[PDB]
Design an enzyme around this catalytic site. Structure first.
Site, PDB file in Angstrom:
ATOM      1  N   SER A  61       3.991   6.143   1.138  1.00 11.85           N
ATOM      2  CA  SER A  61       4.898   6.126   2.281  1.00 11.85           C
ATOM      3  C   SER A  61       6.076   7.086   2.168  1.00 11.85           C
ATOM      4  O   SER A  61       6.778   7.277   3.162  1.00 11.85           O
ATOM      5  CB  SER A  61       5.428   4.722   2.511  1.00 11.85           C
ATOM      6  OG  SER A  61       4.387   3.928   3.042  1.00 11.85           O
ATOM      7  N   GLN A 117      -1.138  -1.789   9.152  1.00 11.83           N
ATOM      8  CA  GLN A 117      -2.267  -0.909   8.898  1.00 11.83           C
ATOM      9  C   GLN A 117      -3.105  -0.726  10.150  1.00 11.83           C
ATOM     10  O   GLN A 117      -3.305  -1.668  10.928  1.00 11.83           O
ATOM     11  CB  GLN A 117      -3.165  -1.441   7.772  1.00 11.83           C
ATOM     12  CG  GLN A 117      -2.453  -1.664   6.435  1.00 11.83           C
ATOM     13  CD  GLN A 117      -1.972  -0.365   5.778  1.00 11.83           C
ATOM     14  OE1 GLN A 117      -2.351   0.738   6.182  1.00 11.83           O
ATOM     15  NE2 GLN A 117      -1.146  -0.501   4.739  1.00 11.83           N
ATOM     16  N   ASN A 340       1.205   1.527  -8.981  1.00 10.19           N
ATOM     17  CA  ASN A 340       2.013   0.885  -7.947  1.00 10.19           C
ATOM     18  C   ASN A 340       2.711  -0.317  -8.577  1.00 10.19           C
ATOM     19  O   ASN A 340       2.163  -1.417  -8.635  1.00 10.19           O
ATOM     20  CB  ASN A 340       1.139   0.472  -6.773  1.00 10.19           C
ATOM     21  CG  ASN A 340       1.903  -0.265  -5.697  1.00 10.19           C
ATOM     22  OD1 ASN A 340       3.134  -0.334  -5.716  1.00 10.19           O
ATOM     23  ND2 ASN A 340       1.171  -0.814  -4.742  1.00 10.19           N
TER      24      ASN A 340
HETATM   25  O1  LIG Z   1       3.969   2.806   0.693  1.00 10.64           O
HETATM   26  C1  LIG Z   1       4.328   1.604   1.072  1.00 10.64           C
HETATM   27  O2  LIG Z   1       5.418   1.179   0.732  1.00 10.64           O
HETATM   28  C2  LIG Z   1       3.412   0.812   1.965  1.00 10.64           C
HETATM   29  C3  LIG Z   1       3.983  -0.597   2.107  1.00 10.64           C
HETATM   30  C4  LIG Z   1       3.146  -1.367   3.120  1.00 10.64           C
HETATM   31  C5  LIG Z   1       2.464  -2.600   2.527  1.00 10.64           C
HETATM   32  C6  LIG Z   1       1.935  -2.455   1.106  1.00 10.64           C
HETATM   33  C7  LIG Z   1       0.889  -1.361   0.923  1.00 10.64           C
HETATM   34  C8  LIG Z   1       1.566  -0.106   0.375  1.00 10.64           C
HETATM   35  C9  LIG Z   1       1.923   0.826   1.531  1.00 10.64           C
HETATM   36  N1  LIG Z   1       1.420   2.173   1.182  1.00 10.64           N
HETATM   37  S1  LIG Z   1       0.836   2.898   2.506  1.00 10.64           S
HETATM   38  O3  LIG Z   1       1.023   2.014   3.623  1.00 10.64           O
HETATM   39  O4  LIG Z   1       1.583   4.102   2.683  1.00 10.64           O
HETATM   40  N2  LIG Z   1      -0.734   3.275   2.398  1.00 10.64           N
HETATM   41  C10 LIG Z   1      -1.616   2.236   2.943  1.00 10.64           C
HETATM   42  C11 LIG Z   1      -2.984   2.605   2.384  1.00 10.64           C
HETATM   43  C12 LIG Z   1      -2.705   3.335   1.077  1.00 10.64           C
HETATM   44  C13 LIG Z   1      -1.195   3.534   1.026  1.00 10.64           C
END
Ligand SMILES: O=C(O)[C@@H]1CCCCCC[C@@H]1NS(=O)(=O)N1CCCC1
Length: 358
Positions: A61, A117, A340
């Site tokens: 993100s 999502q 993570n």
């Molecule tokens: O980066 C974050 O902070 C978000 C937070 C939203 C909820 C947790 C999942 C991690 C998420 N990563 S993401 O949404 O960017 N992306 C989704 C698919 C792969 C990575």
């Protein structure tokens, strides 16, 4: 590096790596405008490849800061307006719940409950149209913030439509290349795969999977050197020669909404400096960061406040990243890891380092 910076970084990051079992990590500290780099551990455990200053990490993100700035640049170019209805750039979005939902709402997660999502079932462009047409808001526009890839992801896709460029082409030509981020990618080229770290999830080596609006919401991979340059560019936008890009960076740090003590920018999130560390540390936990929260509109938005803690957390399945900076102090930090690990541990470490240096 000055022994002060060295000791401050090592005394904070060494226990963090041990406590969180982080396989590899890179840190950059920007102090009085200059970068200082630190690396630990492994980019690839199996092939015994160390983390270096050229290792690519998945930003997760933190990619949304690039999307926010690219959108800001399109505004500065006069290609879009944040006050524009979403339907101006996607006329096929005819369902009535979209009346009153503007690009600002998409960019700032305030459209009324767009989901975190995009469903994995969605792939083709017609799958995407169907998803948004069928989506039912829980709230009126501009009343509640719910952090969402399907919100800022759509903003990024629509923001580049008038340019005629693909999102990746627009990002490359309008953001990466002007800032000399020459090792920053939405799609990692074969020539650079040697430097692409593996992420580690439950001990398994993983890379981010393709998904709808992935480029726009979580798709950037970068090195610690390019990320330090990204922080420098956001610390001092006026030293940037391209006019609309300098302006777009400023727009992304404007304060559009307030919830609690935090302000929502375009991608970036901001708090008044000095911050209560417990506010940013606890506030970074997903229990708060992903919750549905009422917002107060900042009418009109406040221009970028130099006395701010500006930051963004980011993660993929195998990676965890954090960027924070304080324009007033010419001070900033990037932390990239190929695990993570919990957001509060990131923000606590960053605050310890920056507080000791300011
Ligand atoms: O980066 C974050 O902070 C978000 C937070 C939203 C909820 C947790 C999942 C991690 C998420 N990563 S993401 O949404 O960017 N992306 C989704 C698919 C792969 C990575």
């Amino acid at each position: 590096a000055p022994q002060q910076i060295n000791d401050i970084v090592h005394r904070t990051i060494t226990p963090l790596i041990e406590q969180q079992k982080i396989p590899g990590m890179a840190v950059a500290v920007i102090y009085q405008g200059k970068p200082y780099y630190f690396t630990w551990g492994y980019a690839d455990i199996a092939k015994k490849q160390p983390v270096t200053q050229q290792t690519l990490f998945e930003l997760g993100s933190v990619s949304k800061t690039f999307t926010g700035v690219l959108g800001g640049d399109a505004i500065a170019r006069g290609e879009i307006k944040l006050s524009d209805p979403t339907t101006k750039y996607w006329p096929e979005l005819t369902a009535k719940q979209w009346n009153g939902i503007t690009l600002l709402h998409l960019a700032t997660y305030t459209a009324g409950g767009l989901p975190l999502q995009v469903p994995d079932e969605v792939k083709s462009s017609s799958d995407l149209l169907r998803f948004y047409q069928n989506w039912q808001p829980a709230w009126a526009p501009g009343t509640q913030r719910l952090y969402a890839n399907s919100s800022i992801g759509l903003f990024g896709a629509l923001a580049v439509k008038p340019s005629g460029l693909s999102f990746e082409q627009a990002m490359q030509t309008r953001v990466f290349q002007p800032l000399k981020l020459n090792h920053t990618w939405i799609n990692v080229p074969p020539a650079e795969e040697k430097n692409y770290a593996w992420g580690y999830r439950e001990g398994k080596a993983v890379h981010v999977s393709p998904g709808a609006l992935d480029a726009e919401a979580y798709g950037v991979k970068s090195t610690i050197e390019d990320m330090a340059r990204w922080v420098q560019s956001n610390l001092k936008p006026l030293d940037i020669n391209e006019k609309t890009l300098q302006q777009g960076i400023q727009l992304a740090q404007s304060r559009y909404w307030q919830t609690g003590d935090m302000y929502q920018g375009l991608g970036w999130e901001m708090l008044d400096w000095p911050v209560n560390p417990d506010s940013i540390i606890n506030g970074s936990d997903n229990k708060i960061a992903l919750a549905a929260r009422p917002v107060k509109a900042i009418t009109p938005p406040t221009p970028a406040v130099r006395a701010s803690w500006v930051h963004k957390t980011g993660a993929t399945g195998g990676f965890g990243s954090y960027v924070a900076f304080i324009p007033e102090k010419e001070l900033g930090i990037v932390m990239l890891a190929n695990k993570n690990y919990p957001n509060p541990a990131r923000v606590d470490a960053a605050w310890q380092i920056l507080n000791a240096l300011q």
